[PDB]
Amino acid sequence: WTATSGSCKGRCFELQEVGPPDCRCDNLCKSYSSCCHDFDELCLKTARGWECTKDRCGEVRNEENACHCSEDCLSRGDCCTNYQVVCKGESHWVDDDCEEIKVPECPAGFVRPPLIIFSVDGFRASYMKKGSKVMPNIEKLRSCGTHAPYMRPVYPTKTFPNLYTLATGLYPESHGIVGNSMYDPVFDASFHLRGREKFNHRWWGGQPLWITATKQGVRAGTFFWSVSIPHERRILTILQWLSLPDNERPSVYAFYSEQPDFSGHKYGPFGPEMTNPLREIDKTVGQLMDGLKQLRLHRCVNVIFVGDHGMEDVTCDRTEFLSNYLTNVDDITLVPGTLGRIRAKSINNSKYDPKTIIAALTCKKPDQHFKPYMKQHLPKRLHYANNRRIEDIHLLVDRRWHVARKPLDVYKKCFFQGDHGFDNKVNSMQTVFVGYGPTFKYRTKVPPFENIELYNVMCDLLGLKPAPNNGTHGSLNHLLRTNTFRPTMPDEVSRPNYPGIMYLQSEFDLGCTCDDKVENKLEELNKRLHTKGSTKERHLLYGRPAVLYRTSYDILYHTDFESGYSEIFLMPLWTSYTISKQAEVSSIPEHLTNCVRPDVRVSPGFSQNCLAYKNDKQMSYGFLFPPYLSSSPEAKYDAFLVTNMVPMYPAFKRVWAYFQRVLVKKYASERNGVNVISGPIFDYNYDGLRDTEDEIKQYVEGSSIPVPTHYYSIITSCLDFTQPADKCDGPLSVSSFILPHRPDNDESCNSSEDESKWVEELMKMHTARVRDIEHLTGLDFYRKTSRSYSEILTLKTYLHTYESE
């Protein structure tokens, strides 16, 4: 019920929302069907349009008009945005030369520069260059302020997940808005774009920026706007709030445009009909900037122009149908389109089996345009699994395609030419970032970054402490002139032991053998020095990683590599080695094919054993430092130590051996040397975070050797590739991966072919940030470099995406 007989007199676009049954006057009342009877008349005036004309200048105030051109309008805060241009001889903001804003130039009574977020739906990154001739206001913000060539959205690349990620700094799996449509099985409730369930606060987790501000005594505008409020009135409303008295006036605001998304769905991303919507958005930016200039705020406010996601070419004829794969198609519910999510149609059907659905969808047609996954097997960089609202079965859809259940779903619902939602590394899904104002840098270009990082910066801009989030605070300090956040490196929790030779060979009963019984004072002192760390500066280039949790581990030194060996997990947490451009690749000699050697620094009780691998018919083993890259025949014996061994499915050994034998050397040739850090990851509950011992679901048969869910590598070199990796004076360059440790290669449809046709393609799909590996391992990397900590934070968030320009 609503008692719509109240009135909006003196309450238009009120900031405090009122409780039913009392009628509402706020910027969402229309969406709730709750506005007072007189809201249109009083709050949505349109008379005489949105621009002053020569004949209106100095008019007698008429309160019926949409905006004003009378002499009293500046003190009332309600002039048309072009008033000073038409009536007082001023220039439009876009026509003024740009001039560095070195300090905030704010009216008396402003305690801090306000922040205005101008958000645009569907604004693809390439529009900034391709549309620049028709967007002069936007082009000025871009060239004069701080800009990235693009900003990476979160997966799925849909509207609600991305706007709420911008507002919270959280991945969708943590904030709870995991699509535009959702079913929550604990609530037994469905969330949709249309309708009222989405207004229930239980869907929306974390803490959005407007709440963070309000809790810390910084007042906020209401961010949301009902679709029927025209853009001109949204801008006039912001400008009027900015004229409130000091104690009532907000410091943070948002504008939202449904364009260019709305037209992009109809016409495709570059349809000739797209020029007009871009023109219209630019005009809206111009109205805001002219309006700020009238209020003497144009060199006081920080403005962010940001998009949620891009737009791709997608038509009805590029649809794959599950009815062409499944016998049982009526026993499933599909969330369809640019991703798929599958669950049982009925919880009472005991003949539902996910294994058989997955198998019927795997590599069945030669050009198949989607790939099925159990959600825990999705690339870790997507962070798309730890939420009961994400269905176990997921379909990753190729760019330009849709998936649907049956053909009748597509013609009883071609209309559309654009859509979005695909993998967030796809070029067409990238969106925009520009920052302009006293707190941003002047004429500065910054590298691409992820939208999860912006909440921290918006908090910095307003002097707020951010709520706990998935950004890396300090990684975007290079965007800011002032208000930088200066973090300290985390303290190491566990210090290592440095074991010497403590065990005789006969103390070990591991069931291992090696043909190594082959015998010098020159070379003996030498090998002793290598075991005490004499080559460590070559192989550990950025210091040892720090262990940020409580555990027992040993540092082990060798000629060609250094490791941190866990006594609890019975394997290295990390293994570090450097491969120069000149390094040579060799084979594993015939006599050493099955060689595994006891490590006399590490007790039998804290070692793996060969017998377990023999008896486990599914599990084999591999090595973290590759025997192929040994510096000499004698050093090669170190690579077969039981302390360098890790458990590997034979199917995974195909991937790992090609990485180690072919790819590492290729990268050293291309990059002028590389430093490699490799290791295991355990994430059995798919939360993106290091497992404790009691979370491990699988062991090598009959032993306490835990099986990793994934294997990582971090590959570092000099950004100036004219210097070798091991003698680099300046910034670094990195690429990393987190490969799933699977007992089959079903993910790779071309795996019966030679590794040269499919392994590198797998690795590119599973590209990762250093920071992703940090979360998964409890390790902290790059502790000892010549670089500033903020620069290192930026390096740790880099993602190598393998898309062209």
Ligand SMILES: *[C@@H]1O[C@H](CO)[C@@H](O[C@@H]2O[C@H](CO)[C@@H](O[C@@H]3O[C@H](CO[C@H]4O[C@H](CO)[C@@H](O)[C@H](O[C@H]5O[C@H](CO)[C@@H](O)[C@H](O)[C@@H]5O[C@H]5O[C@H](CO)[C@@H](O)[C@H](O)[C@@H]5O)[C@@H]4O)[C@@H](O)[C@H](O[C@H]4O[C@H](CO)[C@@H](O)[C@H](O)[C@@H]4O[C@H]4O[C@H](CO)[C@@H](O)[C@H](O)[C@@H]4O)[C@@H]3O)[C@H](O)[C@H]2NC(C)=O)[C@H](O)[C@H]1NC(C)=O
């Ligand atoms: C990205 O950044 C975020 C934010 O920093 C990281 O997420 C945090 O990670 C922590 C660990 O997973 C987690 O800490 C736990 O908090 C529990 C209290 O949680 C409530 O309170 C907070 C604070 O206000 C709130 O934010 C939470 O909100 C979640 O849940 C509601 C719905 O209930 C949602 O609206 C919201 O979207 C959010 O959901 C997400 O997180 C939850 C987990 O909290 C997931 O289940 C969802 O799928 C979704 O992803 C909550 O309202 C606290 O109770 C925990 O303590 C347990 O564990 C410790 C171990 O130290 C143990 O000592 C305790 O005994 C206790 O265990 C008991 O409960 C167990 C389970 O019932 C039981 O088995 C035991 O036997 C015990 O009885 C814990 O400290 C923190 O909540 C989240 N925060 C958010 C916002 O998500 C995230 O990790 C980052 N991602 C990456 C990859 O780095």
Ligand SMILES: Cc1nnn(Cc2cc(C(F)(F)F)ccc2CCC(=O)N2CCC(Cc3ccc(S(N)(=O)=O)cc3)CC2)n1
């Ligand atoms: C989602 C989402 N998440 N966070 N925001 C706010 C936002 C954020 C950000 C920021 F700075 F982060 F970039 C910028 C702009 C907005 C406003 C978005 C807006 O104006 N739209 C119209 C209403 C629509 C339906 C709706 C109406 C009402 C409600 S609710 N449940 O809050 O009443 C939800 C969705 C949602 C889109 N939107």
Ligand SMILES: [Ca+2]
């Ligand atoms: Ca959108």
Ligand SMILES: [Ca+2]
């Ligand atoms: Ca985990």
Ligand SMILES: [Cl-]
């Ligand atoms: Cl969705």
Ligand SMILES: [K+]
């Ligand atoms: K075996």
Ligand code: NA
């Ligand atoms: Na295969």
Ligand SMILES: [Zn+2]
């Ligand atoms: Zn859209």
